Write a protein that binds this ligand. Structure first.
Ligand SMILES: CC(=O)N[C@@H]1[C@@H](O)[C@H](O)[C@@H](CO)O[C@H]1O
Ligand SMILES: [Ca+2]
Lengths: 272, 123
């Protein structure tokens, strides 16, 4: 009935994150009885001003998804967020397009509820401290600041990949993310460039609070490094006007509401 | 092996200043070029780039797939996939002298500003 406190009293701080034991969603659902169809949750204890759509780009990584759900659902409930989990599944065989799938997630999530914050997260990143809140701030937020892959450090100050959070306004302000980055690399840098061109700065928790684990995996022959990525990021200032939310097109092939999440399989076309 | 910035910086000391490129600039280039992975392999446009420096077999090193490239560096491309950086560095110097820094496409867009973060204070 009343607003949730600024900081949740349920936080535990650091957590052990391991990808050795096998996960069972049925057990996951059992442990998280408060999560509703489609992976929706809303605090019944207080009112959260954080209406968060968590968007996960995805293709053929059901096992990573299992761990993601096993670790995040309890964390997100502790953080007292009014959230929804959206897996944006790329149908087909073209190179993976992370940013386009995040754009899709943004539009589809809005059909479900009036979310005011969007967390974009790779399916293989898990936060090691629940103090790293999965929500939005006065400035665009970069959440995966100290990934084990980078030695629990931020690899470069312009890094905005992994997990990030933008309020609806911040996202609308940069015309969303690019749709033309096919294959691996650079799209997160393009997004970084967009935020800077729109007068915004990147906010981040410190290196201790932002520790994260990445489930490593074998190279994806379907996500080869994008040869045009270096040329593309040098032109964001001009291309963010013509490539983004305003030019997004795709076809929804299926919407599945599972107990722990919503999965939208989409046909996003091919490299033009 | 995925080296750390400081490990790479220390390994490439003797390239510092060559053709005007600093170690700060190189640490930055190498991170965005290979992610400091001495075993990185990227194959595209009919050629394959190798190691930390992503040296191409199109002109610089000799590979099985393209056995008659100019092999300007006079080295088998597989010598660019280990943790002994001396020959990688020697080849990169040749590229710097012949083609110049723009062989590395990461340099201009990612390493034209905010260079101080790339320093390794570790002796
Ligand atoms: C232009 C480019 O390749 N940028 C990549 C970026 O996409 C990636 O998220 C980051 C961490 O792996 O490393 C950068 O070098
Ligand atoms: Ca070598």
């Amino acid at each position: 009935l009343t607003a949730c406190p600024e900081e949740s009293p349920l936080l535990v701080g650091p957590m052990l994150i391991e990808f050795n034991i096998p996960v069972d969603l049925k057990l996951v659902e059992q442990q998280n009885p408060k999560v509703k169809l489609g992976g929706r949750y809303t605090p019944m204890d207080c009112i959260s001003p954080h209406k968060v759509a968590i968007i996960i780009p995805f293709r053929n990584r059901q096992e990573h998804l299992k761990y993601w759900l096993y670790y995040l659902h309890p964390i997100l409930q502790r953080q007292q967020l009014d959230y929804g989990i959206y897996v944006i599944n790329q149908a087909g065989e073209s190179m993976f397009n992370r940013a386009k799938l995040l754009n899709v997630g943004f539009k589809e999530a809005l059909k479900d509820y009036d979310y005011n914050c969007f967390v974009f997260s790779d399916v293989d990143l898990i936060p090691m401290n629940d103090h790293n809140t999965y929500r939005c701030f006065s400035q665009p937020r970069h959440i995966s600041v100290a990934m084990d892959k980078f030695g629990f450090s931020l690899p470069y100050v312009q890094y905005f990949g992994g997990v990030s959070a933008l309020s609806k306004q911040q996202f609308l302000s940069i015309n969303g993310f690019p749709n033309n980055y096919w294959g691996w690399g650079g799209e997160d840098d393009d997004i970084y460039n967009r935020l800077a061109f729109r007068g915004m700065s990147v906010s981040r928790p410190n290196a201790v609070i932002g520790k994260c684990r990445m489930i490593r995996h074998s190279r994806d022959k379907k996500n080869e490094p994008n040869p045009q990525r270096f040329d593309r990021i040098a032109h964001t200032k001009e291309t963010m006007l013509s490539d983004g939310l305003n030019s997004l097109t795709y076809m929804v092939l299926e919407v599945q509401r599972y107990p722990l999440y919503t999965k939208i399989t989409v046909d996003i076309g091919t490299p033009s | 092996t995925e080296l750390t910035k400081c490990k790479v910086s220390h390994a490439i000391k003797d390239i510092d200043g060559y053709q005007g490129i600093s170690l700060l600039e190189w640490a930055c280039v190498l991170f965005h070029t290979s992610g400091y992975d001495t075993q990185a392999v990227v194959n595209d446009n009919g050629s394959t780039e190798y190691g930390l420096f992503q040296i191409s077999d199109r002109f610089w090193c000799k590979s099985s797939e393209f056995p008659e490239s100019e092999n300007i560096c006079g080295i088998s491309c597989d010598k660019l996939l280990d943790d002994e950086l001396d020959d990688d560095i020697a080849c990169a110097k040749k590229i710097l002298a012949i083609k110049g820094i723009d062989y590395w496409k990461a340099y201009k867009p990612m390493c034209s500003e905010k260079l101080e973060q790339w320093r390794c204070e570790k002796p």
